[PDB]
C-alpha cells in the first residue's frame, strides 16, 4: 500500500458513449464507493444463474439504487492507480454543472473523452453544438492540457482495426479544432461493459499494440485505460505561492469569536501568520486553524478550513472576500480587470454595457463589459480586430470589466482559482473568462 499523489480527472462524452458505466467500472474495481450496495447486488446476482455476475450488471443495480435516494455515500468519487489517488467527475449533463466546472473546487488535471465507436453514435457525439464539445472547450479554456480518449463500444463494431483508426482520425480532428494536440493524447479502444482494456488488456484485438503519447521527456506507451490514467503527468501544486483563501462563510462562535471558513487555493495558512482580507483591507492574526475534527498546524492548498481571528466582526468580512498574507503579496480589491472571454452558445449577442452577474471563486457580482478591446483567434490568441462592436457565440475577446461592488480577483497566470469566472444569463452560463490583467 504505497503513498499516493492526488489528481483530479473529469470524464466527458455524449449520452450514448457509455461514459457512466466506464467511470463506474473504474470506481468499482479501483475505489471504494457505496461498497455495501455493491455487496448486496453481488450476492443478489446469484439469482441470474449459479453465482457468476458481470460488474456492469451490478453497476446497473447500483444506479437504480442511487435513483431511489437510499445509497449512503456522497457524490465525491475517488479511485486509485499505482501512483495516484484520483478524484473523478463523471460530468453531469445538467446545465448548472457548467458554472460548477468553472468555479467549483477541484479543477481537472486531465479530461477523459469517451467516444462511442458505433457509426450513428460516433457522429452524434462530435456535433459542433453538442454538450461534449462544449465540455472539451471549457476544459481547454481552463488550462486542462492533458487529455485521454477512450473509444468505447468496440464490441459493437467487432473490434475492427479500420473502424478504430477512422475514429482516431476523426476524433483527432475534433480535438484539434478545440485546441488539443492529438500527438500528446492516448487513444484507447475499450469495452466499458465487458472490461476490455480497462484494468486488464483485451484479447479481442490482436492488431492492438497499445496506446502512445508524446511527452516532454519521451514517448509513453501502455495498453489499458488504467495505465493511461496512471501516466497522467504530476502537476505542480501552489504550496509555495502567496496565500489566497476565498471566504465561503463567516461565523460568530460564542467564546471563540470570528471564524471565517473557506478553501485554501494557493499558499499555506498557519496559526501566527498575519492575514489581510480583501476588498475591505482588514488585517489581523490567525489564532488557530481547524478542519473537520482536527486542529491544524497548517492548512494547505485544497483544505477547507475554519480559522479564528480577533478584532474582526462578522459584519466587516463576508462571503466572496479573499484572505491572504499581509507579508507576501496581500490581496487587494480592483477598480477593473481585463479578461479573455469565450462566448458560449446562447440566444443573444453581447455589446459594451452588458452587465450580467459573474461568479469568480466565491464572489457573485454583476460586472459591466465596459469595453470590448479586441477580438482574437481563440487557439493562438492572435488579435483579429481592435474594438469589435459586438460578440457572438464562439468568439474569443479581450474585455475590460468594471465590478459593480468591491471585488478581489487575480490574473489567471498568477492565481488560477481567482482568475477564472463564469458569466450567467438566460438561466445558463453564457461565457467563460480568464483574467489577464487587474487594476489593483
Amino acid at each position: 500500500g504505497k503513498e499516493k499523489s492526488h489528481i483530479n480527472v473529469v470524464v466527458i462524452g455524449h449520452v450514448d458513449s457509455g461514459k457512466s458505466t466506464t467511470t463506474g467500472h473504474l470506481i468499482y474495481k479501483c475505489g471504494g464507493i457505496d461498497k455495501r450496495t455493491i455487496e448486496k447486488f453481488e450476492k443478489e446476482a446469484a439469482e441470474l444463474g449459479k453465482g457468476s455476475f458481470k460488474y456492469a450488471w451490478v453497476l446497473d443495480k447500483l444506479k437504480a439504487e442511487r435513483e431511489r435516494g437510499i445509497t449512503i455515500d456522497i457524490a465525491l468519487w475517488k479511485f486509485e492507480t499505482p501512483k495516484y489517488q484520483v478524484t473523478v467527475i463523471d460530468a453531469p449533463g445538467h446545465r448548472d454543472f457548467i458554472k460548477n466546472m468553472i468555479t467549483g473546487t477541484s479543477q481537472a488535471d486531465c479530461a477523459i473523452l469517451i467516444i462511442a465507436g458505433g457509426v450513428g453514435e460516433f457522429e452524434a457525439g462530435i456535433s459542433k453544438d453538442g454538450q461534449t464539445r462544449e465540455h472539451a472547450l471549457l476544459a481547454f479554456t481552463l488550462g486542462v492540457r492533458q487529455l485521454i480518449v477512450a473509444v468505447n463500444k468496440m464490441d459493437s463494431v467487432k473490434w475492427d482495426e479500420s473502424r478504430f483508426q477512422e475514429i482516431v482520425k476523426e476524433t483527432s480532428n475534433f480535438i484539434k479544432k478545440v485546441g488539443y494536440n492529438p500527438k500528446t493524447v492516448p487513444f484507447v479502444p475499450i469495452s466499458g461493459w465487458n472490461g476490455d482494456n480497462m484494468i486488464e488488456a483485451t484479447t479481442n484485438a490482436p492488431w492492438y499494440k497499445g496506446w502512445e503519447k508524446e511527452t516532454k521527456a519521451g514517448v509513453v506507451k501502455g495498453k489499458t485505460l488504467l495505465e493511461a490514467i496512471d501516466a497522467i503527468e504530476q502537476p505542480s501544486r501552489p504550496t509555495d505561492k502567496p496565500l489566497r483563501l476565498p471566504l465561503q462563510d463567516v461565523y460568530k462562535i460564542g467564546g471563540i469569536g470570528t471564524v471565517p471558513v473557506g478553501r485554501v487555493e494557493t499558499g499555506v495558512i498557519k496559526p501566527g501568520m498575519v492575514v489581510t482580507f480583501a476588498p475591505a483591507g482588514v488585517t489581523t492574526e490567525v489564532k488557530s486553524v481547524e478542519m473537520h475534527h482536527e486542529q491544524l498546524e497548517q492548512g494547505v492548498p485544497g483544505d477547507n478550513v475554519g480559522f479564528n481571528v480577533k478584532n474582526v466582526s462578522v459584519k466587516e468580512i463576508r462571503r466572496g472576500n479573499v484572505c491572504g498574507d499581509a507579508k507576501n503579496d496581500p490581496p487587494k480589491g480592483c477598480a477593473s480587470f481585463n479578461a479573455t472571454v469565450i462566448v458560449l452558445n446562447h440566444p443573444g449577442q453581447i455589446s459594451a454595457g452588458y452587465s450580467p452577474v459573474l461568479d469568480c471563486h466565491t464572489a457573485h457580482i454583476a460586472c459591466r463589459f465596459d469595453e470590448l478591446l479586441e477580438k482574437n483567434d481563440r487557439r493562438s490568441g492572435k488579435k483579429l480586430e481592435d474594438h469589435p462592436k459586438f460578440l457572438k457565440s464562439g468568439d474569443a475577446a479581450l474585455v475590460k470589466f468594471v465590478p459593480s461592488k468591491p471585488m478581489c480577483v487575480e490574473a489567471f497566470s498568477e492565481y488560477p482559482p481567482l482568475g477564472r469566472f463564469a458569466v450567467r444569463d438566460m438561466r445558463q452560463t453564457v461565457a467563460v473568462g480568464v483574467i489577464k490583467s487587474v487594476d489593483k
Binding site: 435516494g69 461565523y251 471558513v261
Partner: protein, 90 residues
C-alpha cells in the same frame, strides 16, 4: 428515461447553536417534480460548527439547482449559505 444527476449539497448554519434537525427537516420538505432527496449527515467543519451534507437526485431538465439552492436559502432562520459539495452524472 430522463437524464439525471446526483448532487451533494452542503447547507451551512448560522452558528454552533443552530437547530440542525429543523434545518434538514426544512430542506427535505422542499418538493419539486424530478427531485428525490437522499441520505444526509451532519459533518463538523471546525470550532463546534457542523454543516448539513445531503444528497439529492435530479432530473436535469426539470430541476434547476440554482433555484433549489435559492429555495433552501429562504430558511434564513437556520441557513447561512448552500454550496455544491460534489455532483455526478447518473
Amino acid at each position: 428515461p430522463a437524464a439525471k444527476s446526483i448532487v451533494t449539497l452542503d447547507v451551512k448554519p448560522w452558528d454552533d447553536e443552530t437547530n440542525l434537525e429543523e434545518m434538514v427537516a426544512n430542506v427535505k420538505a422542499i418538493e419539486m417534480e424530478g427531485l428525490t432527496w437522499g441520505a444526509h449527515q451532519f459533518i463538523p467543519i471546525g470550532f463546534g460548527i457542523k454543516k448539513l451534507q445531503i444528497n439529492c437526485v435530479v432530473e436535469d431538465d426539470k430541476v434547476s439547482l440554482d433555484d433549489l439552492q435559492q429555495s433552501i436559502e429562504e430558511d434564513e432562520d437556520h441557513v447561512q449559505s448552500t454550496d455544491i459539495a460534489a455532483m455526478q452524472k447518473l
